[PDB]
Design a protein around this ligand. Structure first.
Ligand SMILES: Nc1ncnc2c1ncn2[C@@H]1O[C@H](COP(=O)(O)OP(=O)(O)OP(=O)(O)O)[C@@H](O)[C@H]1O
Ligand SMILES: Nc1nc2c(ncn2[C@@H]2O[C@H](COP(=O)(O)OP(=O)(O)O)[C@@H](O)[C@H]2O)c(=O)[nH]1
Ligand SMILES: [Mg+2]
Ligand SMILES: [Mg+2]
Lengths: 208, 51, 80, 101, 352, 132
C-alpha cells in the first residue's frame, strides 16, 4: 500500500469523540492522547458518519458488485430494501388487527435477521488424511459465518433457475423466506448442519 | 442544408481565402492535397535517409 | 432569412406577429373596433414585452429573464 | 560500401523514387478525381503502371542506417533498437536516459 | 395532523393550506387520473392506500389564474418549469383535479414524450399520405380520455361527417363518444379519431358548450426531435406524426373558452442534457415561438415548511421505518442528501 | 461584504478542488457554479460532501463555494470533501479539528493509479503462465 505502516485507520464514530472526558478510564484516556501523535489514513469513500450507515448492508452491496460498478450494486440494494418494505406493507394492510401486531415492516430488521437465520454454526474443512479427503466438522469464526450467509444468499439469487426475474425482486423474495426460516438458503444451512453431524466421528481429525 | 445567403457567403469567403470555390466531392479534393504538399519520395527524410 | 441572422430582432418576428393577433382577439372579444396596428403595438406595455423576448433571445436565459418575461406577458394578457 | 546488398537495393529504390516523384504525382492527380473523363483516367492508369517498379515509393524500406536491419528501427534516429540502445547505453545520445517512474 | 388538510375540494385551497396534504378520493383518482400520475407517486398510493397531494405555491398560483379566467378572451398558455423532480407533474395534476371538479372538459396528455419515441407500429396515415399514424399511442390515449370525460362524451355531438372507410362513417350530429368508440375499437382509425376529437373540442368550446382544459405534460416533446425512423432509417420529424401535428394545433391561442396548462420535462426527453430545465432551453427556438406569449410558473424544491410537512406525512404513514429517521439528525441528513428536492426525498425515503 | 470565510485545497487522484467555506450559511454547496445535488447526481457522492459537516454537527450552518477539476465524479467528490474539511477547520474548535483528523477527514489519500509494467498485463496482473 501507499500508506506506510505508521498510518492508523480512521475511527469514524461521532459519539466516541463526544464522550465526556471524565467517563474515560485511565487506560481509555491514554490511548486517546496517543492518537494525537499518530498518522491517520484518509477515510475511504464508503463509510461516513451518517446515522443511516449500516456496515452489513455496505458489505452486502460490495459482495454483489460486478467490475467496480457500485452505482448499480447500490441501486439494486435500495430497490431490494424498497421491495421488501412494500411487500410487508401490503401484507400488513391486508392483515387483521390481531396479525398486524406481528408483521415486521422494517426492511433493515428483516434483512439483518434474514441473514442471521442463514449463518451456519459449524462448517466442513477437507482434511487430507491417508491420501483421502474427509469433510471434517469444524467450528467457524464469526466472520466466516457472516461471509457464508451473505455469499449463499447472493449465489442463490444469481442462479439461472430464475428466468427474467430482476435481482431486487429475487432478493426481496429470498430475504423474506429466510426471515421466516424457509427457502433454499435456509436449507443450504441445514444440509451443511446435517453433513457435519453425519461426520461427527471424524471431528478427531482436526488438530486445532 | 444551407440557406442561399449562407451558401453565397461561404463561397465568397472561400474565394477570398483561396479555397476551392467550385462544388467538389471528397474524392476530387485529393487533387488539392496532392499538390498542397511534397510527394513522400521528395521529402528529405526519404531520399536522404542513409548516410 | 431570420435563420441566418445571428441577432434576434423583434420587428417582423413571431412574437411580434403573435402578440399582435392575441390583442386583436382580445379587442374583438370586447367588441371594440380600435384595430389600428400602430395603436396596439405602441403602448409602453408592448415595449416591456418586447424588451423581455429580445432579452431572452439575445442574452443568457436565466430565471431572472424568465420572471421578467412573465410579468410582461402577465400584464399584456390582463392576468392578475 | 553500404552495409549489404539489401541496403544497396533500397538506396537505389529511394533514388529512383525521387527521380520520378513529380511525374508520378502529376499522373496520380489525373486519376485521383471524378472530374476528368474516364477514357483519359484509363490512359493515366496505364501510364503510371508503366513507370519502373522501383520508382514506386511503397517499395522503400526504412532500414537501420548502420546495420541495415529492416525491422525494429526508431524513425527519429533511423537506427535499429540494437544500434539505438548501444549508443543510448553508453551515454552518446544527447538527452536520452533510462526511464523509471 | 399538521401535514394534512381537511379541505379536499381543490377549489377552496388557499395560501393557508400551503404545505398540507389533501386527500384525492378513490373516485376522482379512478376517474380524473387513469393516467398522468407520476409512476413513483402511483406506487405510493398503493402502499399508503391513499393519494394525498401537498398544496404548494406553484399550483396555488395556477388555480388563482384559472379561477379568474376570462373565457371570452383567447386561451392563456401556462407553462410549469423547474429543475428535475421538483413537482411539475403533480402541480399540473393538482390543477387538473381542480378543473375536473368544475366540470371542465379535460384534454390530458399524460406524457407527450411517448409520442416521439419507441413506436413499434408506425403506419402511413391514410388521411394524409405525408404523415404517420400511431395506432397504439393513439388508442391508449382515447381509452383514458373516455374514462375521464364519460359524462360529457354524449352531450357533445359532432358537427360534420367523418368518413372512416368505404363502409363506416360518422354522420353529422351523432354523439362524440361514437367517434371515440371507433378509434378505441378500430385502432387503425385511432390516430384519425384523436385528430377529430381535438378538432371538435377546440371548435365547440369556442361555441361555449363547455370549458376546456388542455393539459400537456412534457410539452417540450412537440417541437423537438424524435427517435422514430423511416423504413430507410431516415429520422422522422415531429411535424410528420399525425398525432403530434394535431396536438400542436391545440397549443395555439386561436380558440377560447378554456385554458392551456403545460409542464416541461427533461426526464424522458430526446437530445436534451440532464440539467436543461429553462423554457427556451427545453423548448428550443421552434417550441418557444409556438407558445409565445405564455405565463411561466416556476416549480422549485421544498421550502423548509414544505420539507417538514413531507417528513411528517411519511412518518404519519409509518413509511420511514428506520429507527433514526424520526430524529432531528435523521431529518438533517434527509435534507442534505436531497437538497429538499421532492423527488430525491421520496426516492431516498422509499428504503429508509 | 464583511463575511468570514476560509478557503483550502484538496486533491484526490487526478482531481483538484478549492473550497471557500463561509462562517455562516444555510447549507448551500455550489460546485462549479451548480448546486451540489445537480453536479453530483450519485448519492454516494453527496454522502461524501455531508460527511465533513455531519461529523462536527454543522449541517445547515455554512455556505460552500467550491471548484473542482480532473478525475472522475467520485474522485471529485473526495477532493471537495478534503478541501471543505480543511477550510472548515477554521470555524471549529481545536478539539474538533483533532477529532476530524482522527476520523481521517484531513488526510490526503495517497492511493493513485499504479503504472503498468512491461511484460505484464497490468499494474500487477501477469500474462498467463504456461507451465508446459
Ligand atoms: N405536490 C406534491 N405532493 C406530494 N408529493 C409530491 C408533490 N410534488 C412532488 N412530490 C413528490 O416528488 C416527486 C416529484 O415528481 P413529479 O413527477 O411530480 O415531478 P416533475 O417535476 O414532473 O419531474 P420530472 O423532472 O421527472 O419530470 C413526486 O413523485 C412525489 O414523490
Ligand atoms: N379518417 C378521417 N380522419 C379525419 C377526417 N377529418 C379529420 N380527420 C382527422 O383529424 C385531423 C383533423 O385535421 P384537419 O385538417 O383539421 O381536418 P379538416 O378540418 O377536415 O381539414 C386530421 O389530421 C385527421 O387525422 C375525416 O373526414 N376522415
Ligand atoms: Mg414530470
Ligand atoms: Mg487489470
Amino acid at each position: 500500500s501507499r500508506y506506510s505502516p505508521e498510518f492508523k485507520d480512521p475511527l469514524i464514530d461521532k459519539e466516541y469523540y463526544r464522550k465526556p472526558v471524565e467517563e474515560l478510564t485511565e487506560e481509555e484516556k491514554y490511548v486517546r492522547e496517543l492518537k494525537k501523535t499518530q498518522l491517520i489514513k484518509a477515510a475511504p469513500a464508503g463509510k461516513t458518519s451518517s446515522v443511516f450507515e449500516d456496515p452489513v448492508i455496505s458489505k452486502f452491496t460490495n459482495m454483489m458488485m460486478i467490475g467496480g460498478n457500485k452505482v448499480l450494486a447500490r441501486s439494486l440494494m435500495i430497490q431490494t430494501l424498497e421491495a421488501v418494505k412494500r411487500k410487508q406493507f401490503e401484507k400488513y394492510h391486508a392483515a387483521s388487527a390481531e396479525e398486524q401486531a406481528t408483521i415486521e415492516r422494517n426492511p433493515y430488521t428483516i434483512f439483518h435477521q434474514a441473514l442471521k437465520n442463514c449463518e451456519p454454526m459449524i462448517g466442513l474443512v477437507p482434511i487430507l488424511k491417508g491420501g483421502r479427503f474427509y469433510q471434517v466438522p469444524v467450528p467457524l469464526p464469526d466472520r466466516r459465518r457472516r461471509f457464508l450467509a451473505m455469499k449463499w444468499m447472493i449465489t442463490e439469487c444469481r442462479d439461472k433457475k430464475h428466468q427474467r426475474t430482476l435481482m431486487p425482486e429475487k432478493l426481496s423474495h429470498k430475504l423474506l423466506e429466510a426471515f421466516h426460516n424457509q427457502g433454499p438458503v435456509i436449507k443450504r444451512k441445514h444440509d451443511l448442519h446435517k453433513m457435519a453431524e453425519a461426520n461427527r466421528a471424524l471431528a478427531h481429525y482436526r488438530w486445532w | 442544408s444551407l440557406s442561399e445567403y449562407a451558401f453565397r457567403m461561404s463561397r465568397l469567403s472561400a474565394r477570398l481565402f483561396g479555397e476551392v470555390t467550385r462544388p467538389t466531392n471528397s474524392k476530387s479534393m485529393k487533387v488539392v492535397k496532392l499538390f498542397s504538399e511534397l510527394p513522400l519520395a521528395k521529402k528529405k527524410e526519404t531520399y536522404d535517409w542513409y548516410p | 432569412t431570420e435563420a441566418d441572422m445571428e441577432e434576434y430582432i423583434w420587428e417582423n418576428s413571431s412574437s411580434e406577429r403573435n402578440i399582435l393577433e392575441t390583442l386583436l382577439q382580445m379587442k374583438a372579444a370586447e367588441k371594440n373596433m380600435e384595430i389600428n396596428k400602430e395603436e396596439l403595438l405602441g403602448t409602453k406595455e408592448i415595449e416591456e414585452y418586447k424588451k423581455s423576448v429580445v432579452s431572452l433571445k439575445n442574452e443568457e436565459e436565466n430565471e431572472n429573464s424568465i420572471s421578467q418575461y412573465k410579468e410582461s406577458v402577465k400584464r399584456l394578457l390582463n392576468v392578475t | 560500401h553500404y552495409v549489404d546488398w539489401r541496403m544497396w537495393r533500397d538506396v537505389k529504390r529511394r533514388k529512383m523514387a525521387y527521380e520520378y516523384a513529380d511525374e508520378r504525382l502529376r499522373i496520380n492527380s489525373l486519376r485521383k478525381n471524378t472530374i476528368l473523363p474516364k477514357i483519359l483516367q484509363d490512359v493515366a492508369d496505364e501510364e503510371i503502371a508503366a513507370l519502373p517498379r522501383d520508382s514506386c515509393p511503397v517499395r522503400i524500406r526504412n532500414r537501420c542506417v548502420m546495420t541495415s536491419r529492416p525491422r525494429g528501427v526508431k524513425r527519429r534516429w533511423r537506427l535499429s533498437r540494437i544500434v539505438f540502445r548501444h549508443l543510448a547505453d553508453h551515454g552518446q545520445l544527447s538527452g536520452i536516459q533510462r526511464a523509471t517512474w | 395532523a399538521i401535514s394534512r388538510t381537511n379541505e379536499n375540494d381543490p377549489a377552496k385551497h388557499g395560501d393557508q393550506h400551503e404545505g398540507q396534504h389533501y386527500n384525492i378520493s378513490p373516485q376522482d383518482l379512478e376517474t380524473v387520473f387513469p393516467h398522468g400520475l407520476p409512476p413513483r407517486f402511483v406506487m405510493q398510493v398503493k402502499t399508503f392506500s391513499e393519494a394525498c397531494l401537498m398544496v404548494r405555491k406553484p399550483a396555488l398560483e395556477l388555480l388563482h389564474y384559472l379561477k379568474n379566467t376570462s373565457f371570452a378572451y383567447p386561451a392563456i398558455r401556462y407553462l410549469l418549469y423547474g429543475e428535475k423532480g421538483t413537482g411539475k407533474t403533480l402541480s399540473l395534476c393538482h390543477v387538473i383535479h381542480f378543473c375536473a371538479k368544475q366540470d371542465w372538459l379535460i384534454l390530458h396528455i399524460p406524457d407527450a414524450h411517448l409520442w416521439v419515441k419507441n413506436c413499434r407500429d408506425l403506419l402511413q396515415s391514410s388521411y394524409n399520405k405525408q404523415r404517420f399514424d400511431q395506432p397504439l399511442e393513439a388508442s391508449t390515449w382515447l381509452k383514458n380520455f373516455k374514462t375521464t370525460n364519460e359524462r360529457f362524451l354524449n352531450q357533445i355531438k359532432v358537427q360534420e361527417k367523418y368518413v372512416w372507410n368505404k363502409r363506416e362513417s360518422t354522420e353529422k350530429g351523432s354523439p362524440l363518444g361514437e367517434v371515440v368508440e371507433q378509434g378505441i375499437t378500430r385502432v387503425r382509425n385511432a390516430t384519425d379519431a384523436v385528430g377529430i376529437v381535438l378538432k371538435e373540442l377546440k371548435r365547440q368550446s369556442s361555441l361555449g358548450m363547455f370549458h376546456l382544459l388542455v393539459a400537456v405534460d412534457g410539452i417540450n416533446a412537440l417541437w423537438g426531435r424524435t427517435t422514430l425512423k423511416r423504413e430507410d432509417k431516415s429520422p422522422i420529424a415531429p411535424e410528420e406524426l399525425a398525432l403530434v401535428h394535431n396536438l400542436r394545433k391545440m397549443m395555439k391561442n386561436d380558440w377560447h373558452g378554456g385554458a392551456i396548462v403545460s409542464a416541461l420535462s427533461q426526464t424522458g426527453s430526446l437530445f436534451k442534457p440532464r440539467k436543461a430545465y429553462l423554457p427556451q432551453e427545453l423548448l428550443g427556438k421552434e417550441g418557444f415561438d409556438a407558445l409565445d406569449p405564455f405565463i411561466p410558473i416556476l416549480v422549485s424544491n421544498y421550502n423548509p415548511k414544505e420539507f417538514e410537512s413531507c417528513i411528517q406525512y411519511y412518518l404519519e404513514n409509518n413509511w420511514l421505518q428506520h429507527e433514526k429517521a424520526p430524529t432531528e439528525e435523521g431529518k438533517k441528513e434527509l435534507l442534505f442528501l436531497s437538497n429538499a428536492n421532492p423527488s430525491l426525498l421520496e426516492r431516498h425515503c422509499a428504503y429508509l | 461584504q464583511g463575511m468570514a470565510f476560509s478557503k483550502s485545497e484538496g486533491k484526490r487522484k487526478t482531481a483538484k478542488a478549492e473550497a471557500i467555506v463561509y462562517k455562516h450559511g444555510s447549507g448551500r454547496i455550489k460546485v462549479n457554479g451548480i448546486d451540489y445535488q445537480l453536479y453530483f447526481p450519485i448519492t454516494q457522492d453527496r454522502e461524501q460532501l455531508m460527511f465533513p459537516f455531519h461529523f462536527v454537527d454543522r449541517l445547515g450552518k455554512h455556505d460552500v463555494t467550491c471548484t473542482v477539476s480532473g478525475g472522475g465524479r467520485s474522485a471529485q467528490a473526495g477532493a471537495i470533501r478534503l478541501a471543505m474539511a480543511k477550510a472548515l477547520c477554521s470555524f471549529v474548535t481545536e478539539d474538533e479539528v483533532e477529532w476530524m483528523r482522527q476520523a481521517g477527514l484531513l488526510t490526503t489519500d495517497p492511493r493513485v493509479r499504479e503504472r503498468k509494467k512491461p511484460g505484464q498485463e497490468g499494474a500487477r496482473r501477469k500474462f498467463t503462465w504456461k507451465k508446459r
